[PDB]
Design a protein around this ligand. Structure first.
Ligand code: SF4
Lengths: 77, 85, 214, 85
């Protein structure tokens, strides 16, 4: 439990390599943090989290959990 | 003479907190205080300049400012601003 | 009479953190207390509403980081009014010191915490909402509702009056038989106040009732 | 009841800035202490009556000589006559 979870192999099964997984998780974490920061305002922008979280959980851990659960998609622009 | 980030953030927080204390005051009080001390623009205008907007007399501008200072300099709104001094 | 009103207020979503803190502090001050037992301070808050107790417990756990029990046994003993009591024993001193009930390593604060006062209008209306949820009534015996909410000591009542003033809403403190409350009589202020608190359907129902009867 | 055994014996602050922090009116509407128009000066007088630092507030107000509001449970002319006596 902690940095060890979720297992890296399960995550890599959902992406191409480590280099893409880093960017994918980081972008989702930035989205979650941006949603949290401007929650006081009544705003419709950014979404999540899509899983049950704790009182104060790092957004990167939540992003990795959603990625493992398979609730996200990645496209190429 | 190097910008210490802690000091800069402290000054920014002071600037943001000062406006809120003025917010609870009446419209005229906050307006005249801001114009006299130039918080919004940085140019401290004269009493006649302040009274021109509201049309009140010079002496009125003198008194209205004093009541605001008495209000802020009270044991009821000083606590929010005591630390920053 | 007031059950639907309090249900609607409890069901209202809230986002801003400061307003949640103010609401928690208000409810704890009004319908809550502290006990020094076994050498430790325990916080007990008694509510007579279904969703309000859950909302208070969730707010405590989320912002203040504490656990509660949410017992349903009636301190009154009747067990018919569902006198919910929410308890905080672990870290009770920290919760009391960091929620405004006790400060300065001294006596409990009679009035509302200074943080709630001298805040934004949103926090003032949130404090009034919490006060109404904790204790209060909507009587409508005769011509006016008499939206009275009782407070412990003159300080809390007059602080509530002051908070209501910042909303441009008329209010009056009163004392009778040694117990004091804050009331607003005229219908317009009642309607505006209830609208500001967030209730909508109850506000309408009251509006049509008053217009048809009066 | 919930008296905490008169502040109990659990305290970690062990630090006080001054007698401002012990002001009761800080827990109370500032506006009621500055009666505008005609106003009234009895409810806030009652509030001050229970203040634990009333003497310090009165002394500081007299020394700085504020001519507005109600301090130490007294209004402007009570302060004026005390100063003149
Ligand atoms: S005596 Fe002074 S400090 Fe005490 S409540 Fe009155 S105005 Fe405030």
């Amino acid at each position: 439990e902690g940095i060890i979870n979720p297992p890296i192999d399960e995550l890599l099964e959902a992406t191409d390599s480590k280099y893409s997984l880093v960017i994918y998780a980081a972008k989702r974490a930035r989205q979650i943090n941006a949603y949290y920061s401007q929650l006081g305002e009544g705003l419709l922008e950014y979404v999540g989290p899509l899983v049950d979280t704790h009182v104060h959980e790092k957004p990167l851990s939540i992003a990795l959990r959603e990625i493992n659960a398979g609730l996200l998609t990645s496209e190429a622009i | 003479e190097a910008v210490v980030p802690a000091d800069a953030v402290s000054f920014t927080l002071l600037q943001e907190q000062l406006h809120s204390v003025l917010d609870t005051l009446s419209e005229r009080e906050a307006g005249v205080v801001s114009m006299r001390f130039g918080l919004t623009d940085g140019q401290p205008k004269t009493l006649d300049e302040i009274g021109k907007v509201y049309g009140v007399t010079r002496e009125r501008i003198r008194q209205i400012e004093s009541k605001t200072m008495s209000k802020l300099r009270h044991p009821s709104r000083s606590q929010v601003l005591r630390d920053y001094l | 009479m007031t059950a639907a009103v309090k249900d609607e207020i409890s069901r209202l979503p809230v986002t801003r953190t400061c307003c949640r803190k103010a609401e928690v502090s208000s409810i704890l001050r009004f319908a809550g207390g502290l006990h020094l037992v076994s050498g430790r301070i325990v916080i007990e808050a008694e509510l007579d509403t279904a969703m309000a107790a859950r909302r208070l417990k969730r707010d405590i756990l989320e912002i203040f980081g504490h656990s509660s029990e949410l017992i349903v046994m009636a301190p009154g003993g009747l067990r018919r009014g569902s006198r919910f009591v929410v308890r905080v024993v672990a870290g009770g001193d920290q919760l009391a010191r960091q929620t405004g009930l006790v400060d300065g390593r001294g006596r409990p604060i009679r009035g509302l915490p200074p943080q709630v006062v001298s805040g934004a209008t949103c926090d003032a209306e949130a404090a009034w909402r919490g006060a109404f949820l904790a204790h209060g009534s909507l009587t409508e015996p005769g011509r006016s509702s008499s939206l009275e909410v009782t407070c412990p000591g003159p300080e809390a009542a007059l602080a509530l009056v002051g908070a209501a003033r910042r909303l441009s809403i008329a209010a009056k403190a009163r004392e009778v038989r040694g117990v004091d409350r804050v009331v607003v009589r005229d219908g317009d202020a009642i309607g505006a106040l209830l609208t500001r608190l967030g209730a909508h359907e109850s506000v309408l129902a009251w509006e049509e009732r008053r217009m048809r009867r009066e | 009841m919930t008296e905490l055994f008169q502040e109990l014996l659990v305290e970690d602050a062990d630090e006080e800035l001054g007698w401002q922090e012990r002001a009761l009116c800080a827990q109370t509407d500032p506006e009621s202490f500055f009666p505008e128009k005609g106003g009234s000066t009895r409810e806030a007088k009652k509030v001050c009556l229970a203040c634990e630092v009333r003497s310090e507030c009165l002394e500081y107000a007299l020394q700085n000589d504020e001519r507005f509001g109600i301090w130490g449970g007294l209004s402007e002319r009570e302060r004026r006559r005390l100063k003149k006596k």
